[PDB]
Amino acid sequence: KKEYTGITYISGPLLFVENAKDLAYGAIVDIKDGTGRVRGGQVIEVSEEYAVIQVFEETTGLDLATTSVSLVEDVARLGVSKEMLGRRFNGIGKPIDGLPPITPEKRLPITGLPLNPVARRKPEQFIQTGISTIDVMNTLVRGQKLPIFSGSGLPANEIAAQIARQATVRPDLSGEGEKEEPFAVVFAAMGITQRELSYFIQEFERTGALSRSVLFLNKADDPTIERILTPRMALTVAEYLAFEHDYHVLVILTDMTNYCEALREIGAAREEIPGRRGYPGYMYTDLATIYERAGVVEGKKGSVTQIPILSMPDD
Amino acid sequence: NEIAAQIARQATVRPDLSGEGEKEEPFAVVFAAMGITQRELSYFIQEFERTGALSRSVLFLNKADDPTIERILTPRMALTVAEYLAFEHDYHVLVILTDMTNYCEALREIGAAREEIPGRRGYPGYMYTDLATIYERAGVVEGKKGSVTQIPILSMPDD
Amino acid sequence: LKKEYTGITYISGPLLFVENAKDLAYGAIVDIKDGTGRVRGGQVIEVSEEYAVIQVFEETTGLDLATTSVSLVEDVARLGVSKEMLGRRFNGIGKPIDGLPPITPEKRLPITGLPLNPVARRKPEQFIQTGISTIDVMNTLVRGQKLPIFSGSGLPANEIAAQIARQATVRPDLSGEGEKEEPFAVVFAAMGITQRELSYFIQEFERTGALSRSVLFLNKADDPTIERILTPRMALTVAEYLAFEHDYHVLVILTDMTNYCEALREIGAAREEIPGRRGYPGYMYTDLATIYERAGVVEGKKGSVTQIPILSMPDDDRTHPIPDLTGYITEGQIQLSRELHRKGIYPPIDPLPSLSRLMNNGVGKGKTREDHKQVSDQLYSAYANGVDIRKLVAIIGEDALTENDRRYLQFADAFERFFINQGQQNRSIEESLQIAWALLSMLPQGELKRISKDHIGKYYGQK
Amino acid sequence: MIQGVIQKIAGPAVIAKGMLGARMYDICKVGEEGLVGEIIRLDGDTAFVQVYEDTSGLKVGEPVVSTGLPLAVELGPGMLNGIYDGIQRPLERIREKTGIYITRGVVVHALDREKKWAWTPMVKPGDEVRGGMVLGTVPEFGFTHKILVPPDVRGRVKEVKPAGEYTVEEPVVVLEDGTELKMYHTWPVRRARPVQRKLDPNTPFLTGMRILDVLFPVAMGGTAAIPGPFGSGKTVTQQSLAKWSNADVVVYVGCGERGNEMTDVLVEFPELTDPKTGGPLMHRTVLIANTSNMPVAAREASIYVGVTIAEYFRDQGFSVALMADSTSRWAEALREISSRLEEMPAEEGYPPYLAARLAAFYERAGKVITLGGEEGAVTIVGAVSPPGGDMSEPVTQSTLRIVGAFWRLDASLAFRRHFPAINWNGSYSLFTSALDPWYRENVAEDYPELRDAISELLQREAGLQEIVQLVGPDALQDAERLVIEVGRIIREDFLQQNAYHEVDAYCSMKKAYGIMKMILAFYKEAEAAIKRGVSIDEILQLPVLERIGRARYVSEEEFPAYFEEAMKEIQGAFKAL
Amino acid sequence: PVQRKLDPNTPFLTGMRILDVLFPVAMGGTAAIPGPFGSGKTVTQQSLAKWSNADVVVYVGCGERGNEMTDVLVEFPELTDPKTGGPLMHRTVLIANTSNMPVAAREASIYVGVTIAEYFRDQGFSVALMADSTSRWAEALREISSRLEEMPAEEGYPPYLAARLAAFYERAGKVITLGGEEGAVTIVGAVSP
Amino acid sequence: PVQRKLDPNTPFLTGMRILDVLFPVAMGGTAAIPGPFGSGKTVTQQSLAKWSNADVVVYVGCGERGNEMTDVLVEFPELTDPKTGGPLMHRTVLIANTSNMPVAAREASIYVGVTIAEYFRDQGFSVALMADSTSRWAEALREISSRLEEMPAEEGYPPYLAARLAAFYERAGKVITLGGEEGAVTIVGAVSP
Amino acid sequence: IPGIRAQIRFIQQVLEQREREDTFRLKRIKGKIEAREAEEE
Numbered sequence A: 001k002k003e004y005t006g007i008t009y010i011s012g013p014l015l016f017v018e019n020a021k022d023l024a025y026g027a028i029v030d031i032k033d034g035t036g037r038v039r040g041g042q043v044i045e046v047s048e049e050y051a052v053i054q055v056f057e058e059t060t061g062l063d064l065a066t067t068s069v070s071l072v073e074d075v076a077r078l079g080v081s082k083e084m085l086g087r088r089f090n091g092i093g094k095p096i097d098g099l100p101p102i103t104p105e106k107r108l109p110i111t112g113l114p115l116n117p118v119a120r121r122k123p124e125q126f127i128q129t130g131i132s133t134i135d136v137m138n139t140l141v142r143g144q145k146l147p148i149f150s151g152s153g154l155p156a157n158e159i160a161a162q163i164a165r166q167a168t169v170r171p172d173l174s175g176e177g178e179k180e181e182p183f184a185v186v187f188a189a190m191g192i193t194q195r196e197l198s199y200f201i202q203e204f205e206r207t208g209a210l211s212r213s214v215l216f217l218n219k220a221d222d223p224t225i226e227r228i229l230t231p232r233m234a235l236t237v238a239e240y241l242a243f244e245h246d247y248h249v250l251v252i253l254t255d256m257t258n259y260c261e262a263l264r265e266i267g268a269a270r271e272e273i274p275g276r277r278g279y280p281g282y283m284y285t286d287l288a289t290i291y292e293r294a295g296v297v298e299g300k301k302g303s304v305t306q307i308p309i310l311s312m313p314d315d
Numbered sequence B: 001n002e003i004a005a006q007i008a009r010q011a012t013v014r015p016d017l018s019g020e021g022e023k024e025e026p027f028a029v030v031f032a033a034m035g036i037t038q039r040e041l042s043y044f045i046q047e048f049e050r051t052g053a054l055s056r057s058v059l060f061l062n063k064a065d066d067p068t069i070e071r072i073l074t075p076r077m078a079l080t081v082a083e084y085l086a087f088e089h090d091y092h093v094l095v096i097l098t099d100m101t102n103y104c105e106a107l108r109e110i111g112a113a114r115e116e117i118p119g120r121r122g123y124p125g126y127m128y129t130d131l132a133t134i135y136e137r138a139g140v141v142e143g144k145k146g147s148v149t150q151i152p153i154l155s156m157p158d159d
Numbered sequence C: 001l002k003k004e005y006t007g008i009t010y011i012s013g014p015l016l017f018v019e020n021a022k023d024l025a026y027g028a029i030v031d032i033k034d035g036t037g038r039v040r041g042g043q044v045i046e047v048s049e050e051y052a053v054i055q056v057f058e059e060t061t062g063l064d065l066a067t068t069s070v071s072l073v074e075d076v077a078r079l080g081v082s083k084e085m086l087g088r089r090f091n092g093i094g095k096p097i098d099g100l101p102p103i104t105p106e107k108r109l110p111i112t113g114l115p116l117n118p119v120a121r122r123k124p125e126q127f128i129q130t131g132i133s134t135i136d137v138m139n140t141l142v143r144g145q146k147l148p149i150f151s152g153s154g155l156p157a158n159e160i161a162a163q164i165a166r167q168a169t170v171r172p173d174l175s176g177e178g179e180k181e182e183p184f185a186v187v188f189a190a191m192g193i194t195q196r197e198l199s200y201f202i203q204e205f206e207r208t209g210a211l212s213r214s215v216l217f218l219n220k221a222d223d224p225t226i227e228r229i230l231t232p233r234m235a236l237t238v239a240e241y242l243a244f245e246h247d248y249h250v251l252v253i254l255t256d257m258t259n260y261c262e263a264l265r266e267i268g269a270a271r272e273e274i275p276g277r278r279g280y281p282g283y284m285y286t287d288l289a290t291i292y293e294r295a296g297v298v299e300g301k302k303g304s305v306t307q308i309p310i311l312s313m314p315d316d317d318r319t320h321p322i323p324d325l326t327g328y329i330t331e332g333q334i335q336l337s338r339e340l341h342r343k344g345i346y347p348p349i350d351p352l353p354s355l356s357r358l359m360n361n362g363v364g365k366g367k368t369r370e371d372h373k374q375v376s377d378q379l380y381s382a383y384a385n386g387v388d389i390r391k392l393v394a395i396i397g398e399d400a401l402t403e404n405d406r407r408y409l410q411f412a413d414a415f416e417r418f419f420i421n422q423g424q425q426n427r428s429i430e431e432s433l434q435i436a437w438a439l440l441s442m443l444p445q446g447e448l449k450r451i452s453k454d455h456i457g458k459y460y461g462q463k
Numbered sequence D: 001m002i003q004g005v006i007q008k009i010a011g012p013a014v015i016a017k018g019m020l021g022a023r024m025y026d027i028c029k030v031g032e033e034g035l036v037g038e039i040i041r042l043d044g045d046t047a048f049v050q051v052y053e054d055t056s057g058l059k060v061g062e063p064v065v066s067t068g069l070p071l072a073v074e075l076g077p078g079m080l081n082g083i084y085d086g087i088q089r090p091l092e093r094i095r096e097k098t099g100i101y102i103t104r105g106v107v108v109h110a111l112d113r114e115k116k117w118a119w120t121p122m123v124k125p126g127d128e129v130r131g132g133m134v135l136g137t138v139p140e141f142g143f144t145h146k147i148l149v150p151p152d153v154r155g156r157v158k159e160v161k162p163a164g165e166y167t168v169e170e171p172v173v174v175l176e177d178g179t180e181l182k183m184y185h186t187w188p189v190r191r192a193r194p195v196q197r198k199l200d201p202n203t204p205f206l207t208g209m210r211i212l213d214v215l216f217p218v219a220m221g222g223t224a225a226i227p228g229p230f231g232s233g234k235t236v237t238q239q240s241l242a243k244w245s246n247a248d249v250v251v252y253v254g255c256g257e258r259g260n261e262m263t264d265v266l267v268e269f270p271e272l273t274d275p276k277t278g279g280p281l282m283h284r285t286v287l288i289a290n291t292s293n294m295p296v297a298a299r300e301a302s303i304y305v306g307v308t309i310a311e312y313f314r315d316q317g318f319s320v321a322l323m324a325d326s327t328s329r330w331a332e333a334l335r336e337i338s339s340r341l342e343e344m345p346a347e348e349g350y351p352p353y354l355a356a357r358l359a360a361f362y363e364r365a366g367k368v369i370t371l372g373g374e375e376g377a378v379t380i381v382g383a384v385s386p387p388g389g390d391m392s393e394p395v396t397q398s399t400l401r402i403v404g405a406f407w408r409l410d411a412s413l414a415f416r417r418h419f420p421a422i423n424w425n426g427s428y429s430l431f432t433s434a435l436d437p438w439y440r441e442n443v444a445e446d447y448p449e450l451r452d453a454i455s456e457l458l459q460r461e462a463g464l465q466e467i468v469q470l471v472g473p474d475a476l477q478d479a480e481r482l483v484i485e486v487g488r489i490i491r492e493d494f495l496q497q498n499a500y501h502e503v504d505a506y507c508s509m510k511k512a513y514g515i516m517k518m519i520l521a522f523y524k525e526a527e528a529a530i531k532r533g534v535s536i537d538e539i540l541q542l543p544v545l546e547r548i549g550r551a552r553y554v555s556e557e558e559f560p561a562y563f564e565e566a567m568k569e570i571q572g573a574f575k576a577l
Numbered sequence E, F: 001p002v003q004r005k006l007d008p009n010t011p012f013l014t015g016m017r018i019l020d021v022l023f024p025v026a027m028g029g030t031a032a033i034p035g036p037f038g039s040g041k042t043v044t045q046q047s048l049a050k051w052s053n054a055d056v057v058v059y060v061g062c063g064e065r066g067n068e069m070t071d072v073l074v075e076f077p078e079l080t081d082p083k084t085g086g087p088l089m090h091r092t093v094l095i096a097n098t099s100n101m102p103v104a105a106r107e108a109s110i111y112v113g114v115t116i117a118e119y120f121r122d123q124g125f126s127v128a129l130m131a132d133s134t135s136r137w138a139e140a141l142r143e144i145s146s147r148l149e150e151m152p153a154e155e156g157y158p159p160y161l162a163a164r165l166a167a168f169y170e171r172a173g174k175v176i177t178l179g180g181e182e183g184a185v186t187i188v189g190a191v192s193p
Numbered sequence G: 001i002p003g004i005r006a007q008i009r010f011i012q013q014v015l016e017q018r019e020r021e022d023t024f025r026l027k028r029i030k031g032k033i034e035a036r037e038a039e040e041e
């Protein structure tokens, strides 16, 4: 409803819908082509006279005569349910195994609000990987975020899959544990190839590791905006599970090199002066708004624990 | 700051080795200062009030909490005073221009409010002329007895 | 029937805008008549419906807005060419600068080139002797090849330019016997030269007798930069005309490609656009490929164009974009060195970093002589392990080497002053090879590991 | 077909007015001649055309018409034995028309519109077709070329033509919506031809070279990358893995290179020999050719044209091998395109989206069940060339992030005359873990274990070459001179391979396994023997060594009989000391 | 405002063994801790928070890990200041602006911290302000500058960077307040280059 | 205007040993001397202008300090021209636009010096022109192209910089004058990076 | 060898960054020259 027409100007990934005073800043539109090919896009810079839609995907086949702009769902929301566990999704939550899609128990925003610093408690307990030098010399306290700094040719995906399919929490080492503490792994694999994808498919369907994990494979020939949104969908699902059903969710974000390259690609649209190695200025902020969403909360029993894996590009 | 205060404490001219005759005129000091903090200003003021120089020195203090553009006026204030007192009353003026890096950042700020095309590392294209119009107001005059001797200070950034 | 657009506004530096010009094509050449009557040249960039833009070639001094008028001439840039121009000098644009009358142009050609068709381009197969022995033996120029000369600054690249210009010939003896007639030409595009280098060239050509088969496109440094951009287009279109319509074998010598790229950078900044890597423009690779890929033999045509561009690397690096992109299109390089030049060696080519990527399919049996590639390989490896033994003996002491390393030491030091230190004599290819075997015969047989048995049997044991 | 005029020219940028409704990234004909450019940055009414050729000569006033479609490839029969360029134009007919120059304004068609093909229908009038379904074949070159439904259109069908002999402009099936399907159809070159399942790598791309399928496999559908320095035998390995390969359609993409570095291809690659007929090779080859001074957008779009053509041959069920040569050249074509669109560069002058584009190229490559219901693959051997031997250049780094196997070619081994000049130190393969059960069920049961034995023996020789360099080969221990001697016989009979010898060229898995086991059996009995009863000179002087050295010069039709004699002779001649 | 500014002659006992012996810092002093990641730089800020001789401590974190601030809220009300007794949380005012909290407020967070420390200066205490990651404050000045379309200098930062940062660090010192009683505020700034 | 350009076969004897032996320069030759600050450019060019075998010498101080021009005014007339018996100051014309004298006139300074040198060439003399700090003239061009809002080339210099430097350095060179007798201008340009 | 190659990669980085700032400021000059002399009044 209310398709804004009257696009004045389309240049790169940008288009200028005029007579758009009703669009909010930061709203999400979909652009309808004359053939009928819809696309996502985000309102930036809404003036008194036009709005600068950013087309996330390519602007190919767009034109000025017969292009429409709708307005779809002002904040990017997500439908989550606890029957996600055991099913592999897209970067943006399309199911990719042929099992039928999710009816949403709740629909909740994928940015996530900041936790309140007086509401967070301290990371206390211990979760067990299988790696001896991750368990004894370093130690992955649940509730923290700690990265694995791999390199160029090192095995990072093999260790990702290993401490995904074997890491457990053992409450019997302490007492009182309610021995089957509900545990889950959210594995967000971003910017991966087809070979690595098929590797992770078979590695999770070998043992029962898929039956307690959610999967967010990205298969790097997709549009770059899916590679942006993959950590946010993963952490939205993980925050839901851990703060509404008291799990101990362990999120592995597979390749944070590809997230930041995708960030450098797509955030060139607003034409600012960039930071050190071509990367944007705000990249501390955008890495922070997905690394800070870990952490435990005083008054709940659930936790989120992150392992971001990233390759030092040169060593 | 200690070497500049030490120079201005004890810099004397020797007529024993030149035949001028004693007649000894000591130095007026024009002490200009641009973004000194407090910790250096208290050093220079304690140094001068000890060695008895605040009766011959005119001080142009621009502390680092005063607004950061009147540094564009301050060396010109000090050198106009120095040109007067040297070339029309026969003094032997010594001008201490503290920390020209603060002055040069004070005009990088203005020259990048005007989108003026810069030299290297952001400083504007004309900065050589401004540093020239400060530094080259020094020297002696033929026919007069005045002089202006400049010790500027620099704080080289990555030294 | 001229048509003066008067009514101009906004002269600025090089630019001037004409009010109503919907007739000028993009990329036309124009006459800018002053108030007094001196005519300048200009090229039309950026034609639009409300104004047209003209980049004036020369200085803008006498210009005002009342009495100033532009006029079209030759709305795409052409060169009026004949076969006759083989004794003539020209200045970028293509006007005679030696007092002889203008040529009668039997054709007129567009100076931007159409690109060849890779189906209709056969492969380079036969050689072209240069006389310079360190070229003709170790990295042979073949016909249909482009190979540059990576000068330094202080090195005499202009003198070796003139020497290859007045000394190169094909030689129809040592092929399969091939109709000796085989006419030959040297097109010589000196862009961005001084006055001193110009008087050097127009005395160096006139003294021998080698201006009666060359053609010289010379412009000085204080000539308009856009003429300097047009210059290698002019030279290559004369050469391409000659070689593919009158069966000539043309050698084209492009002096100072660095000065070309600097003029290209300044005109690209005048065009009101944004540069690329290290300040040079974005399209620099395509704009150098446009004037190197106009060389090569063609299937069916008898002619052939060979191309030596001579360029000074700016601050002695091959990672500057000028030698980077030039060596990334062209095939091999030969490289002058300040070290041999300071020891006093002319021409100071060192053959260790030099390379021709196309020698191996140009030399050998029937083309020049049987042993050529083996001799070249043996010379290269023997001098290459002579050099490090020289560097070693400054700490070892000459006693504590064997006999065999000592023989390599004497090889290296007699190599670089009999085979390289040529002087200004002409070494035809067999004199080069007999000096090659005389130099290899300071080593024992069987130390010569690369050469096969018969050549060591036949040519060894000289001098 | 919206048509307007020019109101501004500046370089290659033509601001053309009067075009309301030209879809963005359409390609369009500028001028009276037709210069093909593309439509960027619609603005109100105008549209900014970027012209491919140079625009010297156009006036303000010439008409621009729009073709209406984006950058379109024309897929159909007749594409084989073809030498195209980066926007799919045939260079052979441009040579026939306009002499020796690619003059601007040339309009030629990609497929011959005047050549009869012998139709053979394979639907009944009445059926229902969907995208990617076969509807009849064409005998092309001893090659049952099929004709597919284009990937969108569907419906029932009356009026299929009978078994005539037609031309490519003829509507052969006419659906129930008008909708006349010709033999050929266009396709946008920047979209993946859609299939139903990307399969998973289970099956090796059998190259023929017994280093690059034994030690570093590439696993049909996957992705390899090779660097090329000079002298390293680049062309002989590319031509040998087009010649002796597994896949039965070869697409070669030369994406902008030196003219005399590709005219050797154009005078040698036709005159090869397909070793399944004895006929020429070009009856299963498309050859996209660019020199450097061809316009920039052709050089940018050439690898997309190549991968889209090879996806079309994948969609018929044929294994396809794609050799995309010198992708660093394509990368700097993309860098110039980024410079003329006024963008801020990345690390070097490359754009931000460089890894996105290279991922889009190397990820349209894979084993697939097509829409028809049959498998195929587009395995890419896509080569790279850093201009300085200078890996961690951004192109080579992005390539090595998204490839599956990487094969170095040192010139030093070519200098020491070791061909194929692959270096087993810097190279690597990531498909050895997936090709494990295929080997275990087709080559032999223990195959990867003796693979790993030979690989670590190479590791050991390369390790203790150090005090070989300090001392010499003749004063080691006695169990270490054995390691370097077996490392030398591995390098001189299992890795070195004459690509011109008629029988040493092709080497299957049974033969490579036989040679491999034979060397390994010699070593495991010689290392047991050197500590009990023999010297070293009573080992290296032994006439089975010549039979292992001859073992690669044996026809595979007569190999296993020779393998039995060689193995039993090893057992006897080491009993005899 | 102040009446006049004494020069410092009295150490600020940081309670370490290298930073009060080798490299001391006086009471009205300014000091900087630049450090790359994984080199502490936060454990030292907290050991300065606990073990000092300041009478009050204004711990301002701007653009910093949230676990830092919840460590300081959880473990401080069970300590003991070695000057009065009572919980060590009873002397600290902490101004948190965590890294994911909005980026424009971490400009003003520094100023609110330095104003509250000056108020406890004017009551005649020896305050210790600890700014954490002034480089993240400078990043906030960059993101409000490029939003405002200015011409930057030296890696994106606006050219008045040293003007603002200098006027921040200048507010330190040991003064006699307008009531006549003396008091001081020291300032320790963490830099994460 | 000129009748003929010759080719140079007579050196420019500087006096300094390394210059007139290892890297000589002929009579109609350009010659350039770059160097860092405080490296010995101005002392070198004063010794060139004090000892060379030229008839007259035009010294262009284009954007250089004033005490090192007052040096030339005070300690030249005590000296003596080596070729004849006049004092040294009778053979030098001295064009001097110093630093703080206004910034547009530097272009005028370089051109006034070279056209005076061309006049004394046309008379028949043999003129040497020591022009220092051509990069200060390049800076003057940069500032006025800043005012013009033209687009700059690399480093900020306007694009016609090298065109004007060539148009200046090609004005030297050992001619046969219009009058019929030969003469020469040699140019030594100091370049300060 | 690795210390010098590290310093070389450091210096190559800072030079590329200053080049990136220059081709930002050129875009700003071109934007401010076109946004006056293409649509003023």
Ligand SMILES: Nc1ncnc2c1ncn2[C@@H]1O[C@H](COP(=O)(O)OP(=O)(O)O)[C@@H](O)[C@H]1O
Residues within 6 Å of the ligand: B113, B114, B115, B116, B117, F146, F147, F148, F149
């Ligand atoms: N509105 C403005 N505010 C600040 N500086 C400006 C403004 N407009 C222009 N400038 C700067 O001042 C210079 C003005 O030059 P210009 O307007 O062309 O001629 P004039 O020198 O007569 O003002 C420009 O180089 C620009 O850098």
Ligand SMILES: Nc1ncnc2c1ncn2[C@@H]1O[C@H](COP(=O)(O)OP(=O)(O)O)[C@@H](O)[C@H]1O
Residues within 6 Å of the ligand: F035, F036, F037, F038, F039, F040, F041, F042, F043, F044, F047
């Ligand atoms: N030939 C020389 N003899 C003696 N001193 C020299 C000579 N050349 C240079 N110097 C010294 O080098 C210093 C540099 O002076 P100057 O030429 O002004 O430096 P710059 O290179 O900055 O112009 C002078 O103080 C002078 O003492």
Ligand SMILES: [Mg+2]
Residues within 6 Å of the ligand: F041, F042, F064
């Ligand atoms: Mg000087």
